[PDB]
RNA sequence: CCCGCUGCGUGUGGC
C-alpha cells in the first residue's frame, strides 16, 4: 500500500474503492482528483499513507520526489521534502526515498512527508557516513560483463561477436558508433537482454533521449528493468534535465556499493541538446558545436567508472558517425577521448545484410588484459591477427558463418585451434 | 612531527592518540576538527607545531601554504604567511616552505606561520641571494635524458624506439602528438618509468589536466614521483589554477639549480581550458580559438628551458590531432612553433595493434647534434635514411621486429651495420 | 645651449 500503487491502479478499481468505503463519486473529473480524495479520506480515517519517489533538490533548499512514470519531471503529484529532513538525513538529488507521507495543508498543493524508512533501498542512517561519489577512488574495469548466453539462438550471435570484438566490463565507458540504419538500437536491445539474463544483480536503467516513441514503447515492453525516455517532440532542456536526474540517481545508487548499468540510446543527440541549451560563447568549432557545449556531456559520460570501494557504473551509449555532418564526427572524436570501449558498425556490412554488422578491425577496448584471462587474451590475439588482413565484409561473413554452429565461444576457440 | 604527518595517519590512530593522553573523544565529527584540537592542545604545552606547504601569494600581499592533497588549491587548512615574512625571505609563488606554525587565536581563522626552517628543501639563508627564473640565461638542451634500459623487456622497446626517433634532453619542450587511442598516455607512463629508473636525481612531477580519473589512479599508484591531477569533472578554471601552481613550483625549484621534469597528460585540454577562461576580444581564429587565448598556454609551455647557470625544466606534453576539429590542428601547429621535440603516433599503426605506434618520419627533435655523440648521430642518420622510403606501418614493424632481439640500441646498430 | 624628469552583423560555423 502506497501512493504509487494507487497511481498505477485502474480507474474502475479506485472509483469502486471510493464508492463502497468513502463518499460516492460518479467520476466526472480527472483520475488524480479521485486519488487525492481517496488519500484525504484515508488520512481522515487515521491510517498512515506510504509514498515513494526520486529526490530532486531545488535552489531554495526544499526538494520534490519525482515519479518514474512522469520520467522524473515535475508533475501534479510530487511529495515535498523540507530542507530540515535533507540536512538531517544528508540526502542529495537522485536519492530514492520511501516513507510515510501526509496530505497537503492549507496553502499547499503538494503532498508532504513526515517520516522516511527506505533511502536508496536500505535503512536511512546508513546515509549518515557514506563516502561521496566524487570521493571514491576510481579504477580500471576489472570484472567482466559476459554478454554470451550459450543458448545458441540467432540473437546470441550478436552477443558472441560483441564478446569477441570489444569486451565489456563493469565500470566501462562504452560507445557504439554507426551510421543510421546500421543496427545500433537493436544491438542495444540485445545488450539489455544479455544483461538481464546473465547479470540479474546489476541495476539496469535504460535511458532513451531524443528518440522515436515507437522505439520507446518497444524498449518498455521487451526490457526487464527501468526504462525512462524523452521523445524527439520534446525540448532540449527536457532531455538535459532527464539525463541529469538519471545520472544523479545512478551516482546515488553507486554510493551504496551497487553495480549500475546505463544504456543510452544516443549520446550524439544528448550532446546536441546540451549544445542547444548552452549559452553562446561566440566561439564555434567545426560543425555547429559551441566551444563550451561539451563540458556537461563530458561530465555525464565520465560519471561511469569502476570504484575500488565497491560497486561500479557502466555506461553504454550509442553515437552516429559517417553521417555527412561534421557535428557527429567531432562529437564522436571528442567522446572517443573520454570513453574506454569502442564498437564500430559499418553501413557496408549492413547493406550486405549480414548481421551483426560489426567492424572488427575498427572496434576494441582499452586495457583488455584486465577483463579477459591470459588464455582468452591469447586466443583473442590470434583471432584478431587472423581477421585483420581481410576486409570488413568478408571477415564478418567468415566469422559469423564460422561460430554459428558452435554454442560457446570457448568451443569455437578450441575448434579454431584444432583446425 | 608535521601537520601533514597528522594528515597522512589514519583516523583511528589519531583518535587513539587523542584519547590516551589528550582529551577524550568518541570521534563524532570530521578528522580536521580532531587535528585542530590536538594541534591546539599540543601548542598549549608550550612546545612548537611544525608544518609545510607550497606558497601561493594573494594580490593583497599575504600568502597561504597550500597542500598537495588539495591539488595546491584553497583548502580548509592553509598556513597563513604574513607579507613581512615574504619580504624578509624574498619568497615568491610556488615556493615550498616548511617551518614552525602556530594555532589560530581569536580573530584568526586558519593556521599561521611564525618561523621557517626550509625553503625549497634548503636553509632560508640562500633564497635571498638567488637569481630569478626570468633572469636566468636560457640555452639549448645539452645533457641527454636516456630513456633506454638494459632490461630487454617488451615495455622497454617503446623507450628504445623513442631514443631512435626523438632524443630527449634536459630542458626540452616535448609534444606527443597523436589522435585519440594512439598510445600517448601509455608512452607517457613508459617515459615516467624510464625517468624514475635512469635518472633518480631529477624532480619528476606529473600533471594530468582533464583526463580519465582511472588514469589518475594508475599514475598515482605507478609513478615514482609527484602526481597532480584535475580530471574532466572539474571546470576549466580549476584546471588553469592547478597548471599555474605546478608551473610556479617548477620554476622555483629550477631557481635552486634543480632538474625538474613535468609530464602533461594533455596540453590540448589545457589550451582548451585557457581558451574557455580567456575574455572574448571579438576575434576568433579558425576552429573556434580566441585570438588572445594562446598567450598563456605559450607561457606555460615555454617555461621549459635549459639554464646555463645550472638546473633545467623539461616539459613533455601530449597533444591531439586528426580529431576533425581545426581547434586541435591550430593548437598543435602553434605549439610546434614554440617546442623542440615532436613525437608523432599514427592511429593506423595503433589499429594494426603494433606498439609503439610511432610515426618515425614525422617525429624528430631540434638540434639533435647537441644531445647525441658523433657516431650515434651518424648511425641515427643511416637508420632514418633506411626507414624513410618504406611506409609508416612497414617502418614500425621492421623497427620493432629488428630491435626485438637486441638488449640495447648499441647492439641493434652493430647488427644493422654488420648485416 | 637652457630644460622640468615618462544580442544580431563581422569573426567563428566555412568547404
Ligand atoms: N540483428 C538484426 N537482424 C535484422 N535486422 C536488423 C538487425 N539489427 C538491425 N537491423 C535493422 O536495422 C533497422 C533499424 O535500425 P536499428 O537496428 O534500430 O538501429 P538504428 O535505428 O539506431 O540505426 C531495422 O530495419 C532492422 O531491420
Ligand atoms: N606500449 C604498448 N603496449 C601495448 N599496448 C599499448 C601500448 N601503448 C598503447 N597500448 C594500447 O592502447 C590503449 C590505451 O591507449 P591510450 O594510450 O590511453 O590512448 P591515448 O594515447 O589516446 O590516451 C590500451 O588498450 C593499450 O592496449
Ligand atoms: N641548414 C641546416 N643544416 C642543418 N640542419 C638544419 C638546417 N636548417 C634547419 N635545420 C634543422 O632544423 C632545426 C631547426 O629548425 P628551425 O629553423 O628552428 O625551424 P623554424 O624554421 O620554425 O625556425 C634544427 O634542429 C636543424 O637540425
Ligand atoms: F539508422 Be540508425 F540510426 F543507425
Ligand atoms: F584517446 Be586519447 F586520449 F587521445
Ligand atoms: Mg536507432
Ligand atoms: Mg590519454
Residue numbers in the entry:
A (entry chain E), B (entry chain D): 1 to 419
List sentences from the manuscript.
Bacterial transcription termination factor, ρ, is a hexameric, NTP-dependent 5’–3’ RNA translocase and helicase. A ρ monomer contains N-terminal (NTD) and C-terminal (CTD) domains connected by a flexible linker. The NTD comprises an N-terminal three-helix bundle and a five-stranded β-barrel, the OB-fold, that forms a primary RNA-binding site (PBS); the PBSes are located around one outer rim of the ρ hexamer. The CTDs jointly form a secondary RNA-binding site (SBS) at the center of the ρ hexamer.
We attempted to further narrow down the path of RNA along the ρ PBSes by determining a cryoEM/SPA structure of ρ in complex with a 99-nt long, natural rut RNA derived from the λ tR1 terminator, which encompasses both SBS- and PBS-binding regions. In the presence of ADP-BeF3, we obtained one reconstruction at a global resolution of 2.9 Å. In the ρ-rut RNA structure, ρ adopts a closed conformation very similar to ρ in complex with an rU7 SBS ligand and ADP-BeF3 (PDB ID: 5JJI3) and to ρ in a pre-termination complex (PDB ID: 8E6W24). Density for six nucleotides (nts) is clearly defined at the SBS in the center of the ring. Density corresponding to RNA regions at the ρ PBSes is fragmented, suggesting that corresponding RNA regions are dynamically bound and precluding their reliable modeling. Irrespectively, the reconstruction is consistent with six nts bound in an extended conformation. At the PBSes, the two 3’-most nts are accommodated at the core PBS as observed before. Density for the preceding nts is lined by ρK102, ρR105 and ρK115 on one side, and by ρD60, ρF62, ρP83, ρS84, ρQ85, ρR87, ρR88 and ρF89 on the other. Structural comparisons between our ρ-Rof and ρ-rut RNA structures showed that bound Rof would block RNA binding at the extended PBS. We surmise that RNA bound at the extended PBS supports the closed-ring interaction network by structurally stabilizing the NTD, reinforcing the sequestration of ρR128 and the repositioning of ρK130.
